[PDB]
What we know:
Chain A is α+β, with helices and mostly antiparallel strands and 125 residues long. Chain A has helices at 4-23, 47-56; strands spanning 31-39, 42-45, 62-73, 79-89, 95-106, 109-119. Chain A: InterPro entries: NTF2, NTF2-like_dom_sf, NTF2_dom, Nuclear_transport_factor_2_euk.
Amino acid sequence: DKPIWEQIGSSFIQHYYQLFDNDRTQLGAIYIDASCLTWEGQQFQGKAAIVEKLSSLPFQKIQHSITAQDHQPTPDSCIISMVVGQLKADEDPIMGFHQMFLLKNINDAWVCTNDMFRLALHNFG
Amino acid sequence: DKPIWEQIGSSFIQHYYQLFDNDRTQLGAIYIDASCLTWEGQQFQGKAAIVEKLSSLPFQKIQHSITAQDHQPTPDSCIISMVVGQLKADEDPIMGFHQMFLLKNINDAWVCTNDMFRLALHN
């Protein structure tokens, strides 16, 4: 009785972070040539540029934890998902993050066409 | 200047928060009948339900400030806008929030088809 979009969105999220936290050089499998990534405000178009950027991050170990995830179907048969959570890389402070994914079913598989990620900064005084 | 999707997206965000902060019962103006909202994990389907929920919020006045806004175009001619910010309702403590919008041009006008909102935790 759980909607298809929640089932698919939840499984996609789990798989994405599993790949991210263990071997991000293998993340291309979930993107396509026409994909777009926005990381910390910077945009990257196309699978090649996206995998290059993600693989390039100066972290040795990364772990994501999901606080909440919401999924909805969109008018063009896609699935849109919003994730709020925390992340811990190396010995950097744990920080919150927000991420959005748009999934489309192509060739009988759900892949990501749009990925937007932003890490929270702490507001100092 | 800014890419077309950032121009449209940033203008939509301004319209949405201006309506929320100044006359939220008129928020229907930026939705369509089939829009969907998930608010603090609860889903409100259709413009009627969405506008009733937002109108019903237990505060008289609210002000939002956007601390970061990111926008992307999609292959199917839509725009995704991702926002982080702070808000203050009446005399309550300032609270952080995250919101995401999916926009589509329907009947020659950009409108929101999907909206997700979450208040910042802070355990």
